[PDB]
Every structure is written in structure tokens, then in C-alpha cells.
Symmetry: C2
Subunit: 273 residues, 2 copies
């Protein structure tokens, strides 16, 4: 509808003629009618055009519109209403997703942190975990659902799901945005393993987190891991973990991350001191 | 084409979705089948709608399909491999295969120069490259990677002016943020050069842009580098508190076990401070 106009603008900005893009299975008329909005074009031909023009399909669609993934839109709306503490609008979003079981479960799980009246039932959570167990390629969808619902999942199932998510990611194409989320959820499961004294699970998650952080930047996850791993060493007898936690606090302080600094500081004063 | 249908089927299979639930009055279930089998086409908007219905981000599609099926992505993966091995022989065979591709060959020669200084892009090649980058509608991954890898052969004044345009017009995706992160790094790199050449009006402009780019983001690595470089700017303006900023960034590197970064920034600190 308007995809053609986006293609024309980017194509012309690169000074690439339509005649230079045409070949045996892509004519100049097919490109022109698409750019003019007079005809659609096959997805394989668009991907061929974007490849010749060195435009990722992600850059192409995001230039056209921000409305192309309803799940990500739902996450941004929830992110907005949660910051506003807009209870009413979150419950309205819950009514929009009443026919979507997993999404409504996730909305109710997020809603509970600011309104204990709303809570996902155990049958709803079990349906979600059953879905996540049956998934063999963990994607952005699955990772976000687990992370935003982990508070209503028992530790045994949460650790089993985490291990399968990490394993599934290791055999994947290694999407970098998903890697970051998989790393953050593994650290969140590591925290709970240390607090509950499941040091066998803790040692396992530590080795996977180190693997996920290797040859990556991701200084935020490394900073959180420094604190959490030091917390593990403090409960294992090593007093050096106390130095690790203090260094992680200094990192938050030096970078002006006041919210993270004060959030971890009171945790350091409660469970360590 | 046929591989495109294979990608959508395994994506739909991984999400445990049936074809009748994806079908609507725009696309019948039988055509979804024929498309996955490579026996029929679908329009580009139908493909985008299918991915959204499957709750698969366009970034996920890029990493699972475009990464191994587009010219620029496969080129970068070969350059990274041959550069890591210092395989100058495999890099020139690459260049001869991309000799007809102008901007790609310019970048290959610019990267080969760091190991084999007899290879350099001509002044006519750089002018065509900067013409192109000055004239694009938006800065995508392709344009950002070109500037970052060829910046050694661009005079400072053009590099700064190109950096201004890149910051203003880069293709931004909220779900991904890969381009935004690269733009932040290249802006910090241009900031370092502006300080060494004592062009502090350019520096103060880049500082304000980098602070904006780091707002509402994590990116602790870029913030740690920016903390050092901003402290170097402060020191070069008589603000000796910049020394504290530079020492703090070095401590962040040391606490996180980033030895290559710690010693590299330490060496710069011991010389110029």
C-alpha cells in the first residue's frame, strides 16, 4: 500500500536506477508499479530488491511504520502504562487480549506488581509453561513471556524452562537481542538459586552465563553478573565476593546509574549486611 | 524464493501454529502451504502479516534468513573471518570478486590497509563513497558500516560533517537498536579525534548528541568509553575533574575483567595525562 513509496525514497537516495535493478525475473514494470502503489510485489522479489539495495528488511519496515509487530507494540504499550501506573488502561489492554491466552496471562502477571487484585491463575500459568516446554526454538516471544511471568512460576519449573531456553538458544542463529534477554533471565534465575541455596543449580547457571557473556560487550549484564556471582561467593564462604558486589556498585555509581545503584545498595545492606 | 518458503514453515512449526489459524480472507490456507513448499508466491505485505501473526520480530527473520541469504551480510562474515586469520590472500580474492561492487571494494581495500599498507582506496574511490553517504535518504547498517571501516581515509572535516548527518538520519528500530548503538560508537570515535585535533566546538556538539543517544538506554560499554573520553575533553579544557572520570572508566574495565580495554586505555592515560 505504502511500502512502494518507502522503497522509492530509499532507492532514489542511493542513486540506483530501476533499470539497473531489473533482471530475468524482476522487470522494470514490476518495480515501478510497486513503487507507484498500483500493484503489489511478491515477497521474494522485495527481498531481492532490498538485498540489491543493501537494506535490511528490518530497516525497511521500520521506515514504513512502527505497527508491523503487534506483540512488540503490546510490550511498548504495557511499558508506557506501567510507567504511568495507569491501572485502568492496563485492564483495558487485558480486555483487548482476552482471546489471547498467553498475552493475557503476561498482562495479569505484570499488572500484579502494582495491583494485587489482579493475578494470573495457576491454570493460566500452567498452560503457559506447558507451551514453553513444548517449544524447541525459543524466540523473542517465548523469552519475554517467561521473563514477565517468572514470578508466578515455581522455582523447579522456572529452572527447567531456563535451562531449555539457554540450550535452545545455543543451537540457534544467535540473535543478539534475544541473547541479551536470555542472559538477563539466566541471571535472574541465578539470583533465586543463590537465595534458595540451590548451589548445584547456581554453579550450572554461572557456567552458562559466562558462556553467554564471552566475546560480547554487554557491560550491563556483566556488571549485574559481577554482583550476583559475588553474592554467590559470599554465601559459599569466599569473602572476596563482597569485594565483587562493592565493585558492581561502584560501576553503577561511576556511570550515573543512580536507580540501579540505590536498588542494589539496599539489597547489599539487607542480605549481605 | 524456495528457501523463503522453507524459512516460514520452520518458523511456523517452531511456534506450533497451524496454517488455518494464519489464513484469513487475504490468504487461504492452501496458498500458505504452497508458499512454504516453494510452489507459489505471496505478496510482501502477506509475508509481513504472517510474521506478525506468528509473533516473530523482523529482527528475528533477519538473523534466521537474511544473515545467510544477502550479499552484504555474507560479505561481512567473510571479511571478519579472513581478517581474524590475517589471511591477506583470501581478502584480495574477495576484493576481486567484489571489484565490480564499488563501495564494497573500497571498504575491503580500507580494511586490507590495516594489515597490508600497499593496498589503499584511491582518492576517487573515497570521493564517490562520501558523495554516496552525503546523499542517502537515511543511514542504515550498510552506510554505518561503510563509514566506520573507511574513516581512516576520510579527512577530519568531512568525517565530522558525515557524522553529523548520520546522527540525524540513521534508521532507528526500537526493537533492535543495533544501528543506534553503532552510531553511538562512531560518534564517540569522532569525538576522540575532535579532541586530539583541538576542535572543541565539534567536541561539544558530539558530546550533546552522545548524551542524547545514551538516554533511556543501557549500553554500559559506550557509557564507560564516553565517561573516559568526556573526562579527556574536560581535562583538555582545564577541568581537572576529568582525571577522576578517566580513572573511573579504567576501574570499570578492571572490575569487569576487560583486560584488553583496561590496558589499552591505561596506556593512553599514562601518555597523555
Amino acid at each position: 500500500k505504502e511500502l512502494g513509496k518507502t522503497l522509492r525514497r530509499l532507492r532514489q537516495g542511493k542513486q540506483v536506477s530501476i533499470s539497473s535493478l531489473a533482471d530475468e525475473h524482476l522487470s522494470k514494470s514490476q518495480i515501478s508499479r510497486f513503487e507507484r502503489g498500483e500493484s503489489e510485489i511478491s515477497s521474494s522479489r522485495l527481498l531481492n530488491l532490498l538485498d540489491k539495495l543493501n537494506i535490511t528488511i528490518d530497516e525497511f519496515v521500520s521506515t514504513h511504520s512502527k505497527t508491523h509487530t503487534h506483540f512488540f507494540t503490546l510490550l511498548s504499550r504495557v511499558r508506557k502504562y506501567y510507567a504511568e501506573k495507569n491501572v485502568a488502561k492496563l485492564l483495558k489492554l487485558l480486555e483487548d487480549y482476552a482471546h489471547k491466552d498467553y498475552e493475557s496471562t503476561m498482562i495479569k502477571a505484570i499488572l500484579s506488581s502494582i495491583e494485587p487484585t489482579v493475578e494470573p491463575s495457576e491454570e493460566e500459568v500452567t498452560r503457559l509453561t506447558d507451551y514453553l516446554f513444548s517449544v524447541e526454538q525459543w524466540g523473542y516471544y517465548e523469552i519475554i513471556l517467561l521473563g514477565n511471568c517468572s514470578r508466578f512460576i515455581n522455582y523447579n519449573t522456572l529452572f527447567l524452562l531456563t535451562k531449555e531456553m539457554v540450550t535452545s538458544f545455543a543451537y540457534s542463529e544467535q540473535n543478539k537481542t534475544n541473547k541479551t534477554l536470555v542472559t538477563q533471565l539466566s541471571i535472574n534465575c541465578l539470583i533465586i538459586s543463590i537465595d534458595y541455596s540451590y548451589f548445584d543449580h547456581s554453579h550450572y547457571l554461572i557456567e552458562k552465563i559466562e558462556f553467554l557473556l564471552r566475546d560480547e560487550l554487554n557491560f550491563y549484564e556483566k556488571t549485574v553478573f559481577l554482583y550476583v556471582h559475588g553474592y554467590y561467593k559470599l554465601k559459599q564462604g569466599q569473602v572476596s565476593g563482597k569485594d565483587d558486589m562493592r565493585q558492581a556498585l561502584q560501576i553503577f555509581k561511576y556511570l550515573g546509574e543512580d536507580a540501579l545503584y540505590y536498588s542494589y545498595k539496599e539489597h547489599y545492606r539487607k542480605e549481605v549486611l
